[PDB]
Amino acid sequence: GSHHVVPNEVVVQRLFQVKGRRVVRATEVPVSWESFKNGDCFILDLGNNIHQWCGSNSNRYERLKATQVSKGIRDNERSGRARVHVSEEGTEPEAMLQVLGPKPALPAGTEDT
Ligand SMILES: [Ca+2]
Ligand SMILES: [Ca+2]
Ligand SMILES: [Cl-]
Ligand SMILES: [Cl-]
């Protein structure tokens, strides 16, 4: 047509919360800094790139599991064809700030149960 004014679709994005005391679960949550808590880990899946983030008060078990979830998306869902970027509070890649916007101060979240 003569005039193309409708925005194109952008790549699907997902965010997982990686949380637990010793039984650690990955739960899909809304893609927003409001999902983030400094007590847990988060996996921001941007398709060809996956951002693995752990908070300063995340526990060992969560950090281990975050590695498994990112690798698992890459390997089981992307056929190995994706880049994992590991970051932490305050070291987030620009690509993650582009998606989530400027980073606010983050709360601790709920104790793991
Ligand atoms: Ca936690
Ligand atoms: Ca705790
Ligand atoms: Cl056209
Ligand atoms: Cl990177």
Side-chain angles (χ1 to χ4, degrees), residues 21 39 57 59 62 110-112:
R21 16 188 8 264
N57 296 309
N59 72 57
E62 292 166 335
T110 304
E111 180 62 48
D112 303 314

Side-chain angles (χ1 to χ4, degrees), residues 1-4:
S2 289
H3 291 92
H4 291 255

Side-chain angles (χ1 to χ4, degrees), residues 72-98:
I73 297 169
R74 179 189 72 196
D75 293 342
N76 307 316
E77 306 179 21
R78 307 294 144 64
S79 205
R81 301 208 71 185
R83 294 201 197 75
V84 177
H85 309 257
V86 180
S87 67
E88 66 192 40
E89 302 194 54
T91 77
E92 298 90 354
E94 188 171 348
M96 191 173 173
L97 299 181
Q98 281 178 336

Side-chain angles (χ1 to χ4, degrees), residues 4-10:
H4 291 255
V5 303
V6 173
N8 281 321
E9 48 185 326
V10 298

Side-chain angles (χ1 to χ4, degrees), residues 22-97:
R22 206 151 292 144
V23 177
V24 177
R25 294 171 178 278
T27 306
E28 189 175 353
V29 292
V31 180
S32 172
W33 285 121
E34 296 284 345
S35 289
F36 280 72
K37 307 295 171 180
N38 74 46
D40 300 320
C41 301
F42 294 86
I43 310 301
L44 176 67
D45 177 9
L46 306 179
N48 296 335
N49 290 282
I50 298 161
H51 290 271
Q52 173 181 324
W53 183 105
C54 286
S56 60
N57 296 309
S58 61
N59 72 57
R60 254 167 63 44
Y61 301 102
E62 292 166 335
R63 298 178 186 180
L64 289 167
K65 183 60 69 176
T67 293
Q68 297 304 267
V69 175
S70 60
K71 176 163 189 166
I73 297 169
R74 179 189 72 196
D75 293 342
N76 307 316
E77 306 179 21
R78 307 294 144 64
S79 205
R81 301 208 71 185
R83 294 201 197 75
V84 177
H85 309 257
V86 180
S87 67
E88 66 192 40
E89 302 194 54
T91 77
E92 298 90 354
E94 188 171 348
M96 191 173 173
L97 299 181

